[PDB]
């Protein structure tokens, strides 16, 4: 039972919980020795694992339309937010090994901070899917939600933004030192003004352009 | 008796030959989940001919997997279908509901096929071009370092506790690095002249480095 | 046997619990002394007598400090 969950929370559907695009991981199995209210608890618990499966699908396909290396910075940051969710899967097992019995409520209880984290990153991933980013415009739609209102999802996206700046410092290291083009194929010649972040002021970006252009001459 | 009993004690060879093993444990639902699910089915009236599962323990199944994963082939569990490893359906420990099981072993078997095919590439070199030999030598230099960690884990199964959820996370930095070889090699196994056969292979690698530059 | 060694396992667990209860309420006694106090509490004993003894033997080394 307490390894059934540790795979049902992981990316494996099972015969107990039925994954669907209509409503994923619906418990349809009943035992006579269960109280009939355990299914509602199980719905609240299955919210967690449904979100994890959704994230895993979206990571699996990646890493004009949605192209470029930028989504392969977003997916890598999304690995980093999921990384203490895997450690927090190990800790449950470590508790389980010694204790003779445990109740579902404690697991439900302990993983409540990711009932804030997960839907509020689900909004971010769906907004990035429905629209198309091929510029440097991933930074806007993460930075729209980095202001946040709930404190775990405020630091979660900080992870992702630091990663995407790490990708940006390859473009802006070959550019600003070597004066090179094709540090990434987009979608004299200079950066397209439309895809530039507005929280970077435009004058500063022009200064960057001049510094890069001087190496050619 | 006298040899069979002493075998049964020391050697493990009984969950896959005569007298399939029975595992007594702590019972009651927390790791007795397979038996509860079976009883649930039996109450639910299939009705007859129970599902054939031979009852292997878990830590063992970890050993058989690590042997398959290291790169030595031909184990009894996980039959071939054309040379492709597939999950065997008599496996059950005392829980794991037999359906999540059949998915998770499939996932790891999919990673085992990736290394299987590379060892197949090499095994047909032992039963000239000189680029193929250098290729194989690179693969092997990677391979031995991969196999060493798995081989170390195998001792530690006897030792602590070792389970599926631990070995999956522990092998995370390897199962990352296998997925790229499955894509790089898939164009290096798909083709006549020795000069186009060399250029096309070098070109895959030369492209793949600039891909994540 | 083995089931007679599992009783001693359920005592070694139980004592770890008693040590945790001892530390979250903060006594100045450690595990070695506490085990003797557990021996005493097995026969059934009143602490209105025992606490005076502990606060006395800790008062019998202030002049030998």
């Amino acid at each position: 039972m307490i390894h059934e969950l540790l795979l049902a929370l992981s990316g494996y559907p099972g015969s107990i919980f039925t994954w669907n695009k209509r409503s994923g991981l619906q418990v349809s199995q009943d035992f006579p020795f269960l109280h009939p209210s355990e299914t509602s608890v199980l719905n609240r618990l299955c919210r967690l694992g449904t979100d994890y499966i959704r994230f895993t699908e979206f990571i699996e396909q990646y890493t004009g339309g949605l192209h470029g290396i930028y989504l392969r910075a977003f997916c890598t940051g999304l690995d980093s937010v999921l990384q203490p969710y895997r450690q927090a899967l190990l800790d449950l097992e470590q508790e389980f090994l010694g204790d003779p019995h445990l109740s579902i409520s404690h697991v439900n209880y302990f993983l409540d901070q990711f009932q804030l984290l997960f839907p509020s990153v689900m909004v971010v991933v769906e907004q990035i899917k429905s629209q198309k980013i091929h510029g440097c415009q991933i930074l806007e739609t993460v930075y729209k939600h980095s202001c946040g209102g709930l404190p775990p999802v405020r630091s979660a996206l900080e992870k992702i933004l630091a990663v995407c700046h790490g990708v940006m410092y390859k473009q802006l290291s070959a550019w600003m030192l070597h004066g090179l083009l094709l540090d990434q194929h987009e979608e004299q010649f200079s950066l397209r003004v439309e895809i530039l972040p507005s929280y970077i002021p435009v004058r500063v970006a022009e200064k960057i352009l001049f510094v890069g252009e001087s190496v050619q001459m | 008796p006298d040899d069979r009993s002493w075998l049964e004690h020391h050697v493990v060879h009984q969950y896959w030959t005569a007298r399939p093993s029975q595992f007594p444990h702590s019972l009651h639902l927390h790791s007795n989940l397979a038996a509860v699910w079976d009883q649930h089915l039996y109450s639910s009236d299939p009705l007859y001919v129970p599902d054939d599962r031979v009852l292997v323990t878990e830590t063992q199944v970890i050993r058989e997997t690590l042997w398959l994963l290291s790169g030595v082939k031909k184990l009894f569990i996980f039959q071939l279908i054309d040379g492709k490893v597939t999950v065997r359906n008599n496996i059950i420990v005392t829980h794991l509901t037999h359906s999540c099981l059949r998915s998770v072993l499939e996932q790891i078997a999919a990673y085992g096929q990736v290394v299987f095919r590379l060892q197949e590439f090499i095994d047909e070199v032992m039963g000239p071009f000189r680029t193929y030999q250098a290729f194989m030598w690179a693969l092997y230099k990677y391979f031995i370092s991969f196999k060493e960690e798995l081989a170390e884990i195998e001792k530690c199964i006897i030792n602590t506790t070792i389970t599926l959820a631990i070995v999956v996370d522990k092998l995370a930095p390897r199962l990352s690095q296998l997925k790229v070889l499955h894509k790089v090699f898939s164009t290096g196994v798909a083709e006549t002249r020795n000069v186009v056969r060399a250029s096309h292979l070098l070109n895959t690698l030369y492209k793949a480095i600039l891909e994540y530059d | 046997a083995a089931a007679a060694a599992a009783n001693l396992n359920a005592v070694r667990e139980t004592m770890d619990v008693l040590l945790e209860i001892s530390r979250i309420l903060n006594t100045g006694l450690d595990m070695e002394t506490l085990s003797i106090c557990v021996r005493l509490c097995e026969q059934g004993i009143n602490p209105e007598a025992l606490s005076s003894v502990i606060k006395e033997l800790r008062k019998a080394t202030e002049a030998l400090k």
Binding site: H3, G98, D99 | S26, T59 | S35, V38
Partner: peptide, 23 residues
């Protein structure tokens, strides 16, 4: 007697097939 015995070392061999401190 019991706390005299209690100064022993207990098993660190654990299994996932039992949860009541497997020996």
């Amino acid at each position: 007697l019991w706390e005299a015995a209690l100064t022993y070392e207990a098993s660190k061999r654990r299994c996932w097939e039992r949860v009541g401190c497997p020996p």
